Each structure stands twice: as structure tokens, then as C-alpha cells.
């Protein structure tokens, strides 16, 4: 809801980010995820 949770699909472009203590680590060119 608010932030995007651990290990969520995150969307570096488009689309909240993960709060404190999570990043969007990106897993290939069209794949990235809350790490």
C-alpha cells in the first residue's frame, strides 16, 4: 500500500518504491524486485 514491501515487485520507472530498509535491486533488463 504505502511503500512496496520487502521482496515485492518494485517498478524502478513506474509505481511507489520501497521504504526504509528495502531497495528495488533490478534482476535482469525487465526484471526487478524489493532486495
Known amino acids: ?3 512496496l514491501p520487502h521482496n515485492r515487485f518494485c ?5 511507489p518504491r520501497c521504504c526504509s ?3 528495488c535491486k533490478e534482476l535482469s533488463i525487465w ?5
Do not use: E, V
Open 1 to 3: 500500500g504505502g511503500c
Open 11 to 15: 517498478n524502478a520507472l513506474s509505481g
Open 31 to 35: 526484471d526487478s524486485r524489493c532486495l
Open 21 to 23: 530498509g528495502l531497495k
